Amino acid sequence: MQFHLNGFRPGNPLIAPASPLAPAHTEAVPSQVDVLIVGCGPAGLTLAAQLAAFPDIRTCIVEQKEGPMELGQADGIACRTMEMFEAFEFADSILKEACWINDVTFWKPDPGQPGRIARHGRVQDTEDGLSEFPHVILNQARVHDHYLERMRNSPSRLEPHYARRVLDVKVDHGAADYPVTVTLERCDAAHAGQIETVQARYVVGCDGARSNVRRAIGRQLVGDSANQAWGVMDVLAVTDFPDVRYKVAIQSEQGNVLIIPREGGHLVRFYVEMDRNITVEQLIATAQRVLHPYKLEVKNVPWWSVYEIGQRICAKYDDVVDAVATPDSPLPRVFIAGDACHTHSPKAGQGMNFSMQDSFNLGWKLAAVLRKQCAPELLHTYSSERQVVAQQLIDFDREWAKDPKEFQKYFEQHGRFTAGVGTHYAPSLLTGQAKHQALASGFTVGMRFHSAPVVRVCDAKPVQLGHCGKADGRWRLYAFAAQNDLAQPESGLLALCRFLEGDAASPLRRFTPAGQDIDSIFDLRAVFPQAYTEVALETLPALLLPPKGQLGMIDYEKVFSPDLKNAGQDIFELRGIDRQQGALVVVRPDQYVAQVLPLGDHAALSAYFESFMRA
Amino acid sequence: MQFHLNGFRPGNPLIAPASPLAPAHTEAVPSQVDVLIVGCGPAGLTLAAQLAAFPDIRTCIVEQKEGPMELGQADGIACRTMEMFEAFEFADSILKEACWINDVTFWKPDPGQPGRIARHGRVQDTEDGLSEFPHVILNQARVHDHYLERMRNSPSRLEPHYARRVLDVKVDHGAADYPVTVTLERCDAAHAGQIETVQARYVVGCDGARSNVRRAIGRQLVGDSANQAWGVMDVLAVTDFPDVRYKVAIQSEQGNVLIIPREGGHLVRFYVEMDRNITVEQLIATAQRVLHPYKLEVKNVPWWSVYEIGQRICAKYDDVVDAVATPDSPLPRVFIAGDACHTHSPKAGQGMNFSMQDSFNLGWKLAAVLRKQCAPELLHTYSSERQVVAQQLIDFDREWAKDPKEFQKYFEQHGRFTAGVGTHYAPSLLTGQAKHQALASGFTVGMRFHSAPVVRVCDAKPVQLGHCGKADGRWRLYAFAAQNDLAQPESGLLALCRFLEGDAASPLRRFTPAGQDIDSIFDLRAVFPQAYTEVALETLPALLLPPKGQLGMIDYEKVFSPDLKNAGQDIFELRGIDRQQGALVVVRPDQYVAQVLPLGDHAALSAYFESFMRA
Ligand SMILES: Cc1cc2nc3c(=O)[nH]c(=O)nc-3n(C[C@H](O)[C@H](O)[C@H](O)COP(=O)(O)OP(=O)(O)OC[C@H]3O[C@@H](n4cnc5c(N)ncnc54)[C@H](O)[C@@H]3O)c2cc1C
């Protein structure tokens, strides 16, 4: 991370200086806001944490609960989700506290032993090279804490307005500004029944399964009935079952159970299959029968419930009627994210993960449009992108409901999907057609940017290239240099740089607000195949050693080389970069690859951004 | 980390529940305390952070400054120091904020260019396999913050009493208790001149170079005059010198300069050699002349000073007159740690690192003696251990003041020393003679426990074996199993376990306080050469799957296997364990190896602890 850009600043650098552009939090919900987020769940808090980085935008997030939760229902944190946490700079903390899932063991009835289970299998939870982070388990409330702190420590000093239940949302397609009117009811005993009204430019319903925002704009969850029902109990118990600290799938004559080891090394979660006139004792009794001959002595039960939901999904995620928007469609004003527009069966294994990816998709778009850096039409891509991949995910898990090798295929694909790295957007306003995909085979257009190790040239530090992509709303341009680029500036990477800084028609010059840092909209990172010791910084374009901030201090983290010390760690090899041609990999603020273009196709680059950005 | 041992606990698990055994902090310094620490510098705060883990001990730390510092003079954090930070569970945070030192480049005058420098060399800062953590640079005040938070979040809820200057310390060798009387003068304007008195059992002077505690007990820094003088400036400047983000040693016709890249990617520290009627401007001017033809445009200077000190050291670190203590010597009551008893020349490169190792050495000893778990004689080893290695360090850096390969030898050894991993205690009350060193060649008796990767059997998680050693005052017993131990319990590791739990004469039974967790004094960790998948937990002694806490929850982190997935990562190979015999590696609470014993030499194990522990 970088700090002290404008002078020494004491204390933890992750606490940002309060921005004057942002009015202090008030007891009463403001009358007018840019964005009103409804619901402090994974989705709501994810969006709020993203918008909190832009103090020029007025964001208000409401939640009907009277305060932060301390113990939540979701606990699975996918690899891709961890990558996003890294973007919010708190993945590190999650890794130290969460319970990693390295293996998953399977238990079935012992063939020779009557009514007793035995271990039948074991698989590595995350296939090699799938992600730089592992799949982990951590109490949902803790993820909330991190987002709540990020929000609080942001320049926005953003915090939620609790004990507020959104009663209704209306859009005045005739209003000149703040067309959305939200009616809220205060739920705390001290204000019980009090009605609040908020004028918003955009409203985001992240209010869960029984979302009022969804029903307010007439959308509806379409799907099937609750396939199964699960008894879920978090327990502090003593057992001799040897795989208790692993993620375990148990099938037995007396029922099926799923074991999820919890953070701390002691707590354990049990998913007991069923199908409320059902108790903990019954669940425990069932788990005991299943675990037999292994003994389960439950000492304490911090939490337990009943997880039962069908897979449903809205046809659209916003208030725009057209199934497929076009340049003449009304613009969206209200969006739905998370369970409010799509719920997945427990067996799907998505948990809260996929839900947060909706918010990460919408986040930067809202900010760009509000800042008038992008045409409002951009907002249409939120629904077309997130609705489609959700439906495709459901279609897949619809058949996962079970050749022997066709199953190992289903099993493998399911892993990539639960890890959250299977999302692949189809060609669109933002996504290219992949005609130059061979330039960087390892960076599939439309999928998340698969990070790989590189070596920073300024100080020889080993780093994950994809970690340059932080949740700061910036587009990234990873320019992998052709073999001779460093030696021949007439073309290649250096020529691209020359174009990006000096050609008035370049997207960098056209769309970067006057007076802002040269990398405030487009974060360019250059990667040369040459050993870091062979890259002379002093001979590189200023665009690659950009001054910034009030003191013109130099950013020395824009230039990289491959890891040439350790065998098989060269990113040019790992990601299939065309060595002779090089490659420009354009990445969205949500870490998704938009394009893989030839370094020399400057016109294509300009044209791309001209299609949705505003000069 | 492990938590929820006695029930679900919300919030950050690193915040410990307040212990009732510890009285709340008071505005006025308590009248009587177990330990009085003088000075909130690296040493003082390190000791306080260690003692804060024992709420049954009354610890008071005073500092004359009126509050925590925000910008300190020291900034180099050695590998070994990082290992200790890992023991205090905040090494992670330091790694994310600090500026890593991967390479060190050397610059000298260009032979063909008049009065201009050119790069002459480059070396990897930390030789391969020296430590699992790198050498890093971070503002001293931040290390203080971490210690201050650890202290605050401990069961002790420990915080410093500021604006107190210790005027005098006296020992009443006739007192029945609290033989040490400390006289303090309040320095804050509101209490200016007020005299405070404290009765303490032990006093630790961590009050720096001009320490009053040292002079109070008649000790004195013996050494040579200030070899050199250095102008030190932390600056926010713009330069085109290409190696500014590296640690750089520059020798030129116009002077010598040392570049230390600071946390944040922008701040930089410059050590300008000299030898106060000297200004920043002069330093800057000198640095510019040195950096020529490279330009240095200083924009801001958060801090600057003049580092000038000779290498001096006390003959003893406590108030006991005998040069070498024996069973009939008076017991120590006052100890000196850090610069108060030993200062190293800037070129030595020790910074504040070695200083904190004194406190980490004394910490657990004081606690054990106060808890009557160890004979007070143990306290003698503090001085004999820390004084000797400090002097030996000085003797070495005395000659480092410069065959060509004899220099590369001096250069290499100097690196291990600056990394803080060269400390090697000679045989003593605590340190063995190494007659069975071949059992575990990679764990040199008397040196720090060189961690290596292993695989936890309960959940297959990759971990650093040495990270089992936390700053919790516990001795560790790393039992590396013989090849057939798992298959033949009659002897080997399993037999050792049988002895440790069932033989009344075992150190574990003899010295673990009645009613405490079976691993509260001796932290046993077993390592089998077999693949983790081959270790059946359910068939292991209870000592290896120990119940603990109020609920008898099982600790599943006592059993390990090697990393057999990745080539050349098997700890039995990496650390030279005798495969046929196995090995017992006994480690002190400060992470230093005390013994390497045969698994079967139970008598030797007992005898060792009987020599200083109290039943
Ligand atoms: C009983 C139960 C048990 C579950 N068990 C599991 C499990 O074991 N494993 C698992 O992976 N998932 C489980 N889930 C699902 C998991 O909780 C969700 O997938 C996850 O919470 C979805 O995140 P989200 O942001 O979309 O919305 P949610 O987490 O559903 O949050 C919506 C938020 O909006 C607020 N809100 C709603 N309406 C309004 C309104 N009108 N005004 C103001 N605020 C409002 C709510 O109070 C809530 O905080 C369970 C769900 C339930 C209901």
Ligand SMILES: Cc1cc2nc3c(=O)[nH]c(=O)nc-3n(C[C@H](O)[C@H](O)[C@H](O)COP(=O)(O)OP(=O)(O)OC[C@H]3O[C@@H](n4cnc5c(N)ncnc54)[C@H](O)[C@@H]3O)c2cc1C
């Ligand atoms: C001007 C200066 C510049 C330096 N520059 C560098 C540098 O560039 N690089 C580097 O590596 N090292 C530098 N050092 C050395 C570095 O600061 C020390 O090595 C490090 O602080 C030693 O840690 P310590 O815990 O032993 O004691 P110290 O950090 O010296 O702290 C002693 C503490 O005790 C307190 N104290 C002292 N006497 C009393 C009393 N009677 N009553 C109450 N409180 C008292 C002090 O106020 C202080 O907080 C510098 C030192 C000085 C003085």
Ligand SMILES: [Xe]
């Ligand atoms: Xe499930």
Ligand SMILES: [Xe]
């Ligand atoms: Xe750009």
Ligand SMILES: [Xe]
């Ligand atoms: Xe386009």
Ligand SMILES: [Xe]
């Ligand atoms: Xe120095």
Ligand SMILES: [Xe]
């Ligand atoms: Xe022991």
Ligand SMILES: [Xe]
């Ligand atoms: Xe001994």
